[PDB]
Amino acid sequence: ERGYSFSLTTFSPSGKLVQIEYALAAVAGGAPSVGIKAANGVVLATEKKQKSILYDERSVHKVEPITKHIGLVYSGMGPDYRVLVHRARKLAQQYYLVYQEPIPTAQLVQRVASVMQEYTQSGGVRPFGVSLLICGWNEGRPYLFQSDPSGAYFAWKATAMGKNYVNGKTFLEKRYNEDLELEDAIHTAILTLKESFEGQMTEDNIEVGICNEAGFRRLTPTEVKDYLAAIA
Amino acid sequence: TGYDLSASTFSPDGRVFQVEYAMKAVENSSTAIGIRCKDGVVFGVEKLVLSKLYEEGSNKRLFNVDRHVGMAVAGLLADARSLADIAREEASNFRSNFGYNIPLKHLADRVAMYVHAYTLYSAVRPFGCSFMLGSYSVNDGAQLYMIDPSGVSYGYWGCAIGKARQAAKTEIEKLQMKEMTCRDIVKEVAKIIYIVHDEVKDKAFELELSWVGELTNGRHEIVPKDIREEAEKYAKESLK
Amino acid sequence: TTIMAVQFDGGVVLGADSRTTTGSYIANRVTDKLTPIHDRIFCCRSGSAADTQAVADAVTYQLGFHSIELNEPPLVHTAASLFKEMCYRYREDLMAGIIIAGWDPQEGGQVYSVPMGGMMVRQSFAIGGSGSSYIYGYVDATYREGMTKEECLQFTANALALAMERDGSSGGVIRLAAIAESGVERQVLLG
Amino acid sequence: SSAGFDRHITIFSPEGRLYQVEYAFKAINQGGLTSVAVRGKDCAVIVTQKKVPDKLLDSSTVTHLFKITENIGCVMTGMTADSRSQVQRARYEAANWKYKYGYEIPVDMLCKRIADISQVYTQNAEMRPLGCCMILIGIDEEQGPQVYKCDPAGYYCGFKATAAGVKQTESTSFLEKKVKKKFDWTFEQTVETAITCLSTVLSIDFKPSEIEVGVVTVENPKFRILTEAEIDAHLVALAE
Amino acid sequence: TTIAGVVYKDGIVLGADTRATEGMVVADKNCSKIHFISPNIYCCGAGTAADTDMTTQLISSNLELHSLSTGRLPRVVTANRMLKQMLFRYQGYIGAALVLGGVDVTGPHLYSIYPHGSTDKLPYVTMGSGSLAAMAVFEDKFRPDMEEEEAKNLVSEAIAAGIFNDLGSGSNIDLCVISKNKLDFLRPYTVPNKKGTRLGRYRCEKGTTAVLTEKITPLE
Amino acid sequence: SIMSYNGGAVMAMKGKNCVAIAADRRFGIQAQMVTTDFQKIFPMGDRLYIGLAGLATDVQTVAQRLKFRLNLYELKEGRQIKPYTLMSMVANLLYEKRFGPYYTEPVIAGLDPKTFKPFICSLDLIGCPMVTDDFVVSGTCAEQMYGMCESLWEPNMDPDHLFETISQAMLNAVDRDAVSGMGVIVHIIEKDKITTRTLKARMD
C-alpha cells in the first residue's frame, strides 16, 4: 500500500472516544449469553438459533476451548470472533513452550486484552465487535473474566452479555448467591437463558460448556436434552 | 454519485462506478474486430490517420506477445503498451519454468488476474483498455479471447471492440465461419471494417490485418497486403 | 543403489534395488526407490536420501498444482523440466541422481536423465546409481530396438540382477513398474 | 445516519452497523443468476444455469462449476472477476494443506481458511471486500457428503439445501416445504428436487442446454461435471 | 542409548533405556527417553539430548494446535511431515534421531527419522548407539502380526541386548504400548541391574568438620 | 578447555525436608589466582537458590539475564516462581544461544513455595534439564565429586548430617583438584530458616 498508518480514532471535545462506544452497540445487538461462577466450577451457556430449518448445528460451535482447562464464549458478530480465538490459541502455546506449564486464566486475559487494545490505537483499522467471557479452574479456585472491545477486562461472579442483558442483570442478582454446585448453576443458567429465548427450547437451540477441576468440557446434546428434561 | 471516487468503495446498490466509468472510455476508441476460422485467427483494426504527419505504420494497435500470440488493443494506447509488456513478460517465465509455449487459456487467466488487481485498491485506478488474444496450435487448434477492464475473460468466435461494437457483430454472425479457410476470411474482414464509417465524421483511415494460423505454420505476423492489395480491391466493391 | 529405465512402444519400464546403506551397514533392508509424482509419471532417485526425498516432494507440489490449473494431464517433459530447475540452481548443495520416466498422451513413453550436474537429456534407456558401472557394458550389447513389454521386463530383471549380485551397496529385492496408457503395474520380484 | 465516513469505509456506524459489507450482500445480485445445492444422501448435487445471449460467444468457456481439487468442486455467484480470483486462493491453499500436512484437506477446513481471507478485507480498510459467494461440496470420510457456503463478510456455515444468487427467499421457502418430510434420497430424488425447485422459482421448464450439474457420490468420489446428453436423461425422467 | 519399536497385530510397542552419559561418565541413572506427542502418538529420542527435547515439544505444540483447530484425532503422517521438513532446513545441524509411532484411523504406523531429514516406514526399527545389538534380536525373532505379550517380550529382550552391550543403561527398560483404544506407559518394567549394598561403617560426627563463620537468617 | 579456564565446582544435595548447596571461592586465570571471594551462588527468591560454574564471564552474564526475566515474571504474577518453572526458564535462555552458547552449567536447588518439598536439578551448556533425587554436581572436578557422593549419601537425613555429608564431600574432592579451592561456602536452607556457613579449607 501507500503506507499511511494514521489511526481512525481521536478524542472528542468532550473527551470521549466515539468509535469504541459505537462498537459496544454492536456487542449488545448480538446473541445473548450468560456465565456463572459456582463453588466448584464455571458454567457458560449461550443461545444458538439457526435462521432456518436447513442449517446444521454440528458444524459451527459457540462454546470454544482454548486449552484443556480454558473455554471461551462471546456475544457480538460471528466472523470477528474467529480471529481472536486462533490468536489466543497460538498465544497460549507460546507460554507453554517457555514455561512448560499450562497458562493460568488470569495471565491469558492479560495478553488477549492487549491484542484487542492494539486494533484501537493503530492505523486504519477498526476495533472488534466482540466481547468475551473466559473461564477456567486453575489452582483450585475457578475463574470467570469478561473482556470488551475497548481493551479493558473485569472479574465477574455472574454476568450476562448480549440482548436483554439488563434483564439478566436483575434476574441473576435475585437468583444467584455465594455458593452452589455446578448442577445448580446450570439450572439457573438455563432459567436466565429461558428469559429471552424463542417459544421452544430444545437440545439444539442452546449450547453449554462447563469447567470441572478435571478440565474444560462442552456438553453434547444428549446431556442437554436430559438436563432440560423438565428440570424447569 | 458521491460514492464513486475510490475504486475501493461500493455504491448503495452494490457496484463500483470507477470500473463502470473506465469501460466507456474504451467505447470512444476506434473499432477493432477479431474472427477465427477453422484453422486460424484473423485480426483487423480500423485505424485513423491523426493529421498527415503520421508515418504509415506508426503507433500500431496490433501487438505481438509471443511467438504465436498477439493482441488487438483498443482504448488508451499508452495504457495498452504497459499492459502488453506484462503479457510479454508472463510468457517468458512460463518458458523458463516449464520449457514449452504458453497455452492461451492459461495466458488469459494470468493477465486477467493482473487486470483484476487494479480494480480493488484506492491507490491505483482500473485500466482503460480492452483487447483480443489469438493463437493457433496443432494440439489445440485456434482460440480467441476477450478481456474487459473489469477482468472478465472468456472465449468467442468473433468479436468487436470500439464505437461500433454492436454494429459490427450484427454482420459477423451472418458468416459461416466454422468451415471457411482464413485466406477467405481476410477479404471478408476487409468489408466489415469498410462498411462501418469510412469517412463520415472522420477524414481518413488505414487498415491493419494481423494473421495467425496453420498457413503461417503457427507464426503470428502481419498479412502481406502490400502483396496483392486484395482487401481494398474487394471491400470497395460494396459501394453499390 | 542401481536404477533402471527402458522405454518401449506402449510405455516405459522402471526398476531398482533397495539396500539403503550407511557406510558399510544396511540401514533399510527394503526401500521404495521409485516414487509416484502424478498418475502416469514416476521417478527413481539416487544419491543422498534426504536430498532426493526433499526434491521429489517439491516437484509433486508444483506439478500437481500446475495440472489442476490447466485441467489437463501433465507432460513428462514438463516434469523433467522441474527437476532440472531445482538441481541446477541448488547445485553445490545436493547430490541427486534423478531419472524421470512415464507415459504421456501426446508423446507416449519417454525417459529422461538428470544426473548430479543438472543437465537433462532424453534417452531410449537410462541407468544410474553407484552399481551402474558394472552392468554398463552388458546393457548396450543386449539392448535391441523394438522390444515388447514382456521383453523389457525380462531385460531389466537380468540387468539389475548382475549389479545386485556384484555391487556391495546394491542388492536386496527387485521392484519393477510398467507404465502405459492403461494403468500402472507394480510388482516385487526376486531371481 | 451518515456520521464521519461510515457510508464510505469499513468503520462502525451508530447502532453498531457497518454498511459497506451489507452493500456487498446485494453486490451479488448484479450477476443475474441463481444457484442451488442439495445434500440428501450419500451424494451431493450442484445445479446452476448458464446464460448465453450471443451466438458468437462460446459454450465451454462459460461454466461456473470450478474444480478445486479432485474431491472438491464449487460454484460461484456474484460478479465474475472477483469470483475467479477467489477460486485461485482455494486451489492454492488446498495444495498447501497437502504439502504441509501430508493428506487431503477436508471440505470443512477449507471453508474456514477462505472465510479468514475475507475477514482481513473486512477488518482492514482501503481493501475492497470481494463481492462474490462460494458454495462447496465434497465427501468426508466417516462424515458423509457436505455442503458449505461462505459469505463476503467471512461468515460461513454448512447446511443441507442451499440457494444463492437472486432468488434465495423464494427457493429456500420451497426447500423447507420440500425437505420437512424425510423422504428417501436415492441419487435420483436428489437431482429431481435440485432441478424442479429451480424450475418452479424461475418458471422456465428449460431446454437441456442452459444448466450444469456438478456431482460427487460415494461410488465415484471424484468431482464430476455432467454431459449435455445425460442432463437430458434426467430431464425427460421428470417429465410427468 | 538404545531405542526400538515394533508393529504387532493391533498396535505398536516402543522401548528405550535410562542412561545419559557425558564423555565416558554416567551422568544420569534414570532419563526418560520416550516423549509425549499426542494421546495416540509417542516418540523416542536419540542423539543430542537437548536437540531432541526442544524438537519433540515444538511438534507436540503444533499438533495440539492443529487438532484442536480441526476437531479430530491427529495423523501420524502429519507428525512425520512436520519433522522431516523441519530437520532438512537445518541441514543436519540439529542432531536428532527419532522413532515415531502411533495409531491413526488408518491403523498403526511406525517411522524412523534421521537428522538430515530422511524417513523410512518399517514394521520394526532400532536407533541409537546400541541399535546394532537390538536389531540382532528383531532380525532373528520377528514374525508378522504377533500378539500382545509376544510383542512386549520381544522388545524387552531387544533392549536388554543393548544394555549388556556397552553404553547400555542403569537398566530400567521402558515400554509404551499403543493400541486402538488402550494406552500404556511403564517406566519400571524390568530392573535387572541392582546396585550392591554398602558394607562399610561411615560414622560421621556432629562436629567433625571445622567451621570458620556461621550465619543464621530466619524466615516466615 | 574453555571450561577449564577458571575452574569451579558447584554441588547440590537433597535432604529430608531441607536442601543444601555448596561452591568454592577461588577466582583466577588458568594458573594464577586473583581473589578468594568470587560469588557463584545467587539467591532467586526465598528458599530457592542457583549455582553457576564454568567461564566466569558467562557466570556473571547469565545470572544478570536470569534476574532480568525473573523480576518481570514476579510482577505480571503476584505469586513467586515455582522450582520447575525456573528450570524451564533457564533452559529456554540457554537454548536461544544454540550455536553461540554460554559456557556455564547451572545447578538449581530450592524448596517448594507452598509445600516443603525439596528440588534439585542441573543443566547442560545448551539446556538439557536433569532432575534427580540425591545429588547433582557440576564443574571441572566432576569425577571427584561423584566418587564422594555415591558413598556418603543417605536417603533421609536431618539438617545436621546433611551438613556434614556435603562438607566432607566438598573438602575431599576439591583438594584433589588443582584449579579449585581457596575456601568453600555452604548454604543449607529449610522451611524455617537459612544457614550459611564457610568451612576451614586448605588455602594452597
| DSSP code per residue over B146-157 | EE-SS--B--BS
Provide the CA A46 distance to its chain's centre, in angstroms: 9
Closest CA to B44 of B173, B180, B147, B196: B196
Q: Which residues of A touch E68 (CB under 8 A)?
A: 65, 89
CA distance D51 to D59: 10
- Do E129 and E100 form a contact (C-beta atoms < 8 A)? no
Whether residues A83 and D119 touch (CB distance < 8 A) is answered with: yes
**Touch between chain C and chain A: 3 or more Cβ pairs under 8 Å:** no
Angle at E6 between CA E1 and CA E7, to 5 degrees: 160
Identify the helix (H) or strand (E) that includes residue E213: strand E211-213
Which DSSP string do the residues of E9-45 spell out, in sequence order? Answer: SS-EEEEE---EEETTEEEES----EEE-SSSEEEEE
Q: Which residues of D194-225 are buried (b: 16+ CB within 10 A; e: fewer)?
A: bbebbbebbeeeeeeeebbbbbbbeeeeebee
Range of the domain at B57: 1-240
Residue whose C-alpha cell reads 524421470 in the numeric block: C100
8 Å CB contact between F48 and F81: yes
The grid cell for B208 is: 491493419
Chain B residues with CB under 8 Å of A1 CB are 121, 123
F122 min Cα distance to partner chain A (Å): 16
Q: Are A33 and A44 in contact (CB under 8 A)?
A: yes
CA–CA separation, F29 and C70 (whole Å): 71
Write out the DSSP string of chain F: --TTTT--EEEEEE-SS-EEEEEE--EESSS-EEES----EEE-STTEEEE--B-HHHHHHHHHHHHHHHHHHHHHSSS---HHHHHHHHHHHHHHSSSS---B--EEEEE-SSS--EEEEE--SS---EE-SSEEEEES-HHHHHHHHHHH--SS--HHHHHHHHHHHHHHHHHH-SS--S-EEEEEE-SSEEEEEEE-----
Q: Which of F128, F194, F196, F203 is best to mutate for the E interface (most E CBs within 10 A)?
A: F128
> Environment class of residue B228 by beta-carbon count within 10 Å: exposed (0-12), middle (13-18) or buried (19+)?
exposed
Q: How far is CA A39 from CA A102, A146, A181, A184, in A?
A: 22, 19, 6, 10
Q: How many domains, chain F?
A: 1
- Chain E contact for C28, CB < 8 A? yes
Q: How far apart are CA D61 and CA D25, in angstroms?
A: 26
Sheet holding E2-7, edge to edge: E124-128, E2-7, E12-16, E173-178, E186-190
CA distance E1 to E128: 5
Give the largest CA-CA distance in chain E. Answer: 70
Q: Is residue C111 within 8 Å of C17, Cβ to Cβ?
A: no
**Residue in this structure with the C-alpha cell 437451540, named with its chain if needed:** A205
User: Residues D91, D96, D102, D106: is their CA dihedral positive or negative?
Assistant: negative
SS3 state at D202: coil
**Among F93, F174, F106, F168, residue whose Cα is nearest residue F138:** F106
DSSP 3-state assignment of B196? coil
d(CA E197, CA E179): 40
Do residues A40 and A183 touch, judged by C-beta distance below 8 A?
no
Test C68 with D99 for CB contact under 8 angstroms.
Answer: no
Burial of F70 (0-12, 13-18, 19+ CB in 10 A): middle
A203 close to A224: Cβ distance less than 8 angstroms: yes
Cell of C169: 551397496
Residue carrying the nine cell digits 484437506: D105
In residues, how long is chain D?
Answer: 240
* Contact in structure between D35 and D47 (CB atoms under 8 Å): yes
- SS3 state at B129: strand
Q: How was this structure determined?
A: cryo-EM
Closest CA to F120 of F101, F144, F138, F103: F138
Using an 8 Å Cβ cutoff, are A56 and D159 in contact?
yes
Number of helices (H), then strands (E), in chain D: 6, 10
Quick one: CA torsion of B125, B126, B127, B133, rounded to 10 degrees? 150
How many beta carbons lie within 10 A of that of residue D141, not counting itself? 10
Q: What does the alpha-carbon distance between residue D136 and residue D158 come to, in Å, rounded to a whole number? A: 9
Q: Left (φ > 0), alpha (ψ -120 to 50) or beta: where does B58 sit?
A: beta
Q: Does B239 touch chain A (CB under 8 A)?
A: no
Q: How many CB atoms lie within 10 A of CB B1?
A: 5
Calculate the alpha carbon distances from A133 to A35, A80, A140, A205, D17 in Å: 7, 15, 19, 19, 23
Supply φ then ψ for residue A23, to 5 degrees. Answer: -70, -25
Pairing of strands E34-36, E20-22: unpaired
- Mark yes or no for CB contact F88/A104 under 8 Å: no
Contact F199 E211 (CB under 8 A): yes
Measure the CA–CA gap between C31 and E118, rounded to whole angstroms.
12
Report the SS3 class of residue B40: strand
| Beta strand segments in E8-142, E | 12-16, 20-22, 25-28, 34-36, 41-47, 96-103, 108-113, 119-121, 124-128
The residues of A whose Cβ lies within 8 A of any Cβ of D are: 1, 4, 8, 19, 22-23, 25-29, 52-56, 59-60, 78-80, 82-83, 86, 119, 124-127, 129
Q: Which of E40, E32, E80 is nearest to E177 (CA)?
A: E40
Please check whether residue A139 touches F, CB under 8 A: no
For helices A165-175 and A182-193, the axis angle rounded to 10 degrees is 140
C-alpha to C-alpha distance for A48 and A42, rounded to whole angstroms: 20
- Copy the grid coordinates of residue F20: 543444601
B118 neighbourhood in chain A, CB within 8 Å: none
Which region, left, alpha or beta, applies to residue F151 given φ > 0 means left and ψ of -120 to 50 means alpha? alpha
Please tell me what DSSP assigns to residue E146.
Answer: -
Q: Which residues contact B1 (CB under 8 A, 6 or more apart)?
A: B17
C-alpha cell at F88: 524451564
Of the candidate CATH numbers 3.30.420.40, 1.50.10.10, 3.60.20.10, 3.40.50.2300, the domain formed by A1-232 belongs to: 3.60.20.10
CA distance F44 to F37: 20
The whole-angstrom separation of Cα D152 and Cα D46 is 20
* Backbone conformation region of residue E65, classed left if phi is above 0, alpha if psi is from -120 to 50, else beta: alpha
Where in the sequence numbering do the catalytic residues of E fall?
A: 1
CB D212 within 8 A of CB D226: yes
Closest by CA to E128, choosing from E21, E12, E10, is E21
The residue behind cell 527402458 is C6
CA atoms within 13 A on the CB side of E26: 15
Kindly tell me the burial class for residue E40, based on how many C-beta atoms sit within 10 Å of its own C-beta (0-12, 13-18, 19 or more): buried
In angstroms, the CA D7 to CA D11 distance is 9
Q: Which of D100, D141, D142 sits opposite E81 (nearest CB)?
A: D100
Residue among B196, B223, B198 nearest B209 (CA): B223
Residue B114 CA to residue B32 CA, distance in Å, equals 23
Q: Which of A72, A35, A30 is nearest to A172 (CA)?
A: A35
**Chain-chain contact of E50 with F132 (C-beta, under 8 angstroms):** no
Neighboring chains of A (3 or more beta-carbon pairs < 8 A): B, D, E, F
Q: Which of C20, C27, C50 sits opposite E88 (nearest CB)?
A: C50
Judging contacts by C-beta atoms under 8 Å, the chain B residues touching residue C114 are none
Of the candidates E32, E217, E51, A99, the residue with the CA atom closest to the CA atom of residue F83? A99
Give residue D219's region: left, alpha or beta (phi > 0; psi -120 to 50): alpha
Q: How many domains does chain B have?
A: 1
C-alpha cell at E72: 479430530
Cell 451457556, residue located: A45
Does B117 reach chain A within 8 Å, measured CB to CB?
no
Instruction: Classify residue A133 as exposed, middle or buried by CB count within 10 Å of its CB (0-12, 13-18, 19+).
Output: buried
| DSSP string across A30-47 | S--EEEEE-SS-EEEEEE
Nearest Cα neighbor of A24 from A196, A150, A115 is A150
Structural domain for F43, as ranges: 1-204
| b/e map B50-76, b = 16+ CB within 10 Å | eeeeeeeeeeebbbbbbebbbbbbbbb
Contacts of C188 (CB under 8 A, 6+ apart): C173, C174, C175, C176
Cα–Cα distance between A70 and A95 in angstroms, integer?
14
What are the CA-CA distances from residue E95 to residues E31, E114, E162 (Å)? 18, 9, 21
Distance separating alpha carbons of residues F123 and D22, to the nearest angstrom: 59
Query: Under DSSP, is residue E210 helix (H, G, I), strand (E, B) or coil?
Result: coil
Contact by Cβ (8 Å): D52, D62:
yes
CA angle B17, D135, A81 (to 5 degrees): 80
Active site residues of C: 1
Residues recorded for chain C: 191
Instruction: Give CA–CA dist A172/A159, Å, rounded.
Output: 7
Which of the 8 DSSP states describes residue B116? H
Which alpha helices (DSSP H) does chain C contain, by range? 49-70, 76-89, 138-142, 149-166
Question: What is the C-alpha separation between A147 and D207, in angstroms, rounded?
Answer: 58
Return the amino acid letter for E179: S
DSSP state of D65: E
Q: Output phi, psi for A162, to 5 deg.
A: 115, -155
Query: Domains in chain D and their CATH numbers?
Result: 1-240 (3.60.20.10)
